[PDB]
Amino acid sequence: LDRWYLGGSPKGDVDPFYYDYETVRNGGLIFAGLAFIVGLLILLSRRFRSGGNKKRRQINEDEP
């Protein structure tokens, strides 16, 4: 019910994530900015179909 996230089990030998832990403060801000950029690219995907030259090449027909 809790902690359903996986891949959070290191080798159990050495875990010096403390160095990377400090970034955890500014880590969220950097990640979010990258997140937004990715979303922009998605909109362009629609452009491939949507346009002034019918690039969607999609038609729905009912069978007899």
| Domains identified in the chain and CATH numbers | 1-64 (1.20.5.780)
With beta carbons less than 8 A apart as the criterion, state whether 42 and 48 touch: no
The type of residue at 34 is: L
CB 34 within 8 A of CB 43: no
Task: Tell me if 59 sits within 8 A of 53, measured CB to CB.
Answer: no
Amino acid at 21: Y
| Cβ atoms of residues 20 and 13 within 8 Å | no
